[PDB]
């Protein structure tokens, strides 16, 4: 399979710049999907931003309306979100999503809707060849919203802080126990800013036995994290830091 | 968060647990309530729409109901996998405007204890060429998610320049943490051994490295 959603855009934006994200939708059986945007700030709940439906109608969180803009290019199955004059409070994980949005006709108790006698009435009873015979009332309108499929999320930091590219050091546990049946290899991703980094091994050929640990904020004011793999073959850790446009593929000597 | 949920719920493996979601006549009271599951290091997943309908590929252990302004999510046969944050949601005043609950962290009790696996890395040659030496102590597959890390050089306890992460839940509901000891290269080379000592539920795993065998 069904729809897959990929957010793309910058991981770092300065205060009072415009934040622009793209959502790419692939694998829908359908010509077009209603697409919405949700964010989660660290240690807060989910917050609705807005959506654009298959007719190009936009709806926004009325708190953020004056700051938000959602456009679509159906030629490239893309939806975009612009958020103007961002501050550090706009730091969050941004998700795009497919949304279901529908208005239902709501009839009071003991009243039928539909054309299964009557068709020309919202809510009716025959308590009947023509509509004037039935006992009727006007519908109320109930609003239905829900997210069908979620994206992966994109981490956005709003900060004046400078970027620092990581230094990548190769790690071996070997000298701990040189007769060990297995060897544990790793990479130290040292002194970077901001989050995130992505770490793979052998360009994603080596997935099983991989453990990437959460970043620590060190006393330097910079992040570090480590990734390790246990193996009983060259070994390379692939480290991407999107904020600095840097990739490092580090050779790790295995004992 | 606008809709009210308990911040915490606990149940034991195989038992039943319920999460409530309270709003007003203008959101939850209209129905078409939805529920979302967020397992950490992961994208949210839709569980329930239209008060009671399970989403595609959600198991029948998950069920929901609404009574006026209060929606309830019920998880039967609790598994370790069900540890997550759960959120309810509703349209508010239009189908393109939505409010979320404050979120509930579900804890699943009666999981088996799991001692940490500990790996201690010495400093890389490349780092030592810069007169810095970072010792890295990697701690994984422990339950529950509480460890204390002590570093030793030649029987001395080291407290200066130690940075230990919080424990974070892996996807398998066990925990990981890391400790970093930042030295100069002189400090590294001037000692017979450095040790990472990890205590978990009164038990201690110690790994040791010797500069003499690692440089």
Numbering used by the authors:
A (entry chain H): 28 to 144, 151 to 160, 165 to 269, 275 to 296, 298
B (entry chain L): 30 to 244
Paper quotes:
Here, the current status of the fully automated ambient-temperature beamline VMXi at Diamond Light Source is described, and a highly efficient pipeline from protein sample to final multi-crystal data analysis and structure determination is shown. The VMXi beamline and its associated PXF within the Research Complex at Harwell offer a highly automated pipeline where researchers provide a suitable protein sample that is used for robotic crystallization, monitoring and subsequent in situ data collection from crystals in crystallization plates or in thin-film sample delivery systems. Here we present illustrative examples of data measured using VMXi from a variety of proteins comprising both conventional crystallographic standards and ‘real world’ user samples. Routine RT data collection provides a useful capability that is highly relevant to studying protein dynamics and ligand binding without the complication of cryo-cooling.
